[PDB]
Amino acid sequence: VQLQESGPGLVKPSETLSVTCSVSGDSMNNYYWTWIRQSPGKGLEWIGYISDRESATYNPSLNSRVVISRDTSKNQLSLKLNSVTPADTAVYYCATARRGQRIYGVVSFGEFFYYYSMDVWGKGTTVTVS
């Protein structure tokens, strides 16, 4: 299910920044959809994921000003960036992950934690701010 991303690559600073992502192959109902942005000079920075109850979690280092709306009509996962700074130039990556579970003690007490693994990744679309 190679995802295709349609990014403009040219967004004026302090404006709206939207990046779409196709799914391709199969629908999106039992998969977790994450979004990772990598900026020059550093590594990738996980943003968040959306699935299940439609309550997408956001990174605590982004002020939660970004939103990840998952669509089902056209099967795309866009990004709505508001109040973006002129230093947001970074290539965005569209990939999904499966939520495994790790258990270390009695699971009835609550001794387990959820970890996500990115099974598939998209080539991404490089988008800057000008």
Partner: protein
């Protein structure tokens, strides 16, 4: 400090072995409280 995951203490008792050993108690409790009575156990009420 604690070296590793922070888990909770707990005791384990067999569900079947406790179940049959608690039906032997209720059979003798019927020798002092009437052969035909409903005997129910409950958890401790209060105190230290």
């Amino acid at each position: 400090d604690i070296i590793g995951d922070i888990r909770q203490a707990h005791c384990n008792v067999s569900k079947a072995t406790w179940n049959e050993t608690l039906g032997k108690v209720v059979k003798q409790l019927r020798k002092h409280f009437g052969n035909n009575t409903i005997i129910r156990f409950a958890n401790s009420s209060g105190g230290d």
